Amino acid sequence: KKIIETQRAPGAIGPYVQGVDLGSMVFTSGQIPVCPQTGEIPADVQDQARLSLENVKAIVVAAGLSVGDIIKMTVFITDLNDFATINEVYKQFFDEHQATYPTRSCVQVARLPKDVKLEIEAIAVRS
Amino acid sequence: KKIIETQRAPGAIGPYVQGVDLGSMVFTSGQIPVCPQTGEIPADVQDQARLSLENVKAIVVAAGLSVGDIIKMTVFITDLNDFATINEVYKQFFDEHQATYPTRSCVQVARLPKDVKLEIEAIAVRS
Amino acid sequence: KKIIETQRAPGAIGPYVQGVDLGSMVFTSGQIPVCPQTGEIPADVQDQARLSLENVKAIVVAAGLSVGDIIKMTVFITDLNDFATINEVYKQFFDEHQATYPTRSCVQVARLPKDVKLEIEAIAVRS
């Protein structure tokens, strides 16, 4: 097992790491829509959805994998009224990478770190 | 990295697949109590709990595994008043398949897709 | 698979086992701050955070692993205003065991079993 560290996702500040590479599989921490260059959160849910996905991608790529290697995500959201919009961004993200859609669970939680609108964790496999 | 597709669980609404088979282990998407034939959601939570579990089972069996190969579930619910009823159905389901109980997490979320009362994801292993 | 059972973590109430050992990987059930000897839930969030973590430790140890083998934690909580206290206890727990921090997701849910303030599920790997 090996820690994943990348400047292309928000840095871990505290008692977790961005990702862990087990060889056969990679786990990410839950990624929130904080911009790694600014430490700020875009207000618009479309922009948050894209940025959470970009943060996940940065970690998977730092491990030497690709978006197409992601096989499970969990998408925690604060408002299911945002779901159709989040889904559209998510679908286009995978389509743009010519990637098969992963398995997914999606639930509306009460609140997320920094009052973001979503948090996404991923599991990828090394094929 | 084989996709699992079965008509005995609801077809994928959004950008996800029902299950993925990695060879050593199978992940399902979070299953909601939607009838795969009719698209209907049963009104009583006893019926929703059974249907969510049948939907999980369909995907696991589609991968060539059994209920007894399920090693972890997460049960997301909207009302802890439903918990005893859900636990009863869940226990009977595993017992009917002569299956040891998996590990489990259970939490009450704010809301679920299609306003269902529960969503269940699973991980199964192939020995 | 092998079931993990220890009297050092609370006994299963519902239809679940404490842990499952797959050889390369161990999964725990979501651990809540119930005292394994008395059944009591401590009132204070610092004490709940410590107890949940000890319950995770008991199961990972029963599998022949240790805290430093944990690679992912999901921390479901009822109030993000508790997070600073929870995080300090969590950091101290890993630091006391000279353990690299795992990946993590943290979200605020509506409610948890037995009205606890947090529930922590772990995944560990056998190196």
Curated annotation (Swiss-Prot), chains A, B, C:
Its EC number is 3.5.4.-. Pathway: Amino-acid degradation; L-threonine degradation via propanoate pathway. GO terms for cellular component: cytosol. GO terms for molecular function: deaminase activity; identical protein binding. The keyword NAD does not apply. GO terms for biological process: L-threonine catabolic process to propionate; threonine metabolic process. Keywords: Hydrolase, Pyridoxal phosphate. Substrate binds at R104, S105, C106, E119. It holds the Pfam family Ribonuc_L-PSP. The modification N6-(pyridoxal phosphate)lysine is found at K57. Homotrimer. PANTHER family: 2-IMINOBUTANOATE/2-IMINOPROPANOATE DEAMINASE RIDA (PTHR11803), 2-IMINOBUTANOATE_2-IMINOPROPANOATE DEAMINASE (PTHR11803:SF39). May be a post-translational regulator that controls the metabolic fate of L-threonine or the potentially toxic intermediate 2-ketobutyrate. This is Putative reactive intermediate deaminase TdcF. The lineage of its organism: Bacteria, Pseudomonadati, Pseudomonadota, Gammaproteobacteria, Enterobacterales.
